[PDB]
Amino acid sequence: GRFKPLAVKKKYAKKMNQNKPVPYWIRLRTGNRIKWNEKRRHWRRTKLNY
Amino acid sequence: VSLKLQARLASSILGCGRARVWLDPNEAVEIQNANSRKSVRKLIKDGFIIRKPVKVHSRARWRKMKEAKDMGRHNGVGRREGSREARMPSKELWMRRLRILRRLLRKYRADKKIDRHVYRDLYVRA
């Protein structure tokens, strides 16, 4: 809805900026470990509940 | 191919509804590069998008039926489906009558046809 506290809005804003994939040049480093992001949250599969 | 963005913007510029906008099926090329409300307003002005008129809902079959019912043609006993005191409430028939009687008695007393002793006798009997 419309009401949220700003401290809940700023937690919901962090998770939008974390919901981005691994870039391709990460996959080209020397001691690489990361193929995919393992933390890709989708709004329907798993709920944050802030 | 997909004229879905120009069909959504046309319903909100013409203000009508999607079953009532008419996009020209021939000029699917000139419509699909609209991309703005300014461009769809040029297509509405050019005759490539229009508002169609609404579908008809005619009262002519009711109006002819009312002219029968004003002469009392479809109001008999088999056609009456609800109660007597719902079609005409007997409180409404009493209120309408008693207001006619009291307005007449104020009319004849103000015209001084009757006396205030005659008024008060005929008021409580009404």
Binding site: - | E67, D70, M71, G72
Partner: protein, 121 residues
Amino acid sequence: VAVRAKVGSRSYVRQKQLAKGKKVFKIDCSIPAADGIFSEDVLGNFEQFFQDNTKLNGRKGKLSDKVRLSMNDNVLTISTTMAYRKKYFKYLTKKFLKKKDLRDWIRILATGKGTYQLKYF
């Protein structure tokens, strides 16, 4: 509404004559006549079609001294003292104009407060 109607009284109805008089409805037939289509065989029936089918007090084809037509230069001019509608002679033109298959060539179109104009598309 005050007195009940009768079914037999639907022959004659009340047209409600004007108090002052002379409400005049011109119909300009200049574009379909001079530019071909309407000859002086149909334009002589266009002045006839209103004298034959305009209703007056419910009855058809019996107007006498209440509707007058008189046919000006290219204009059919309906002068009347009975309360007709301007929207009635747009209707009564389209019946004539449908009867001769001319209602895909000609628009009747409002120009002034008391005149029409048959024009092409």
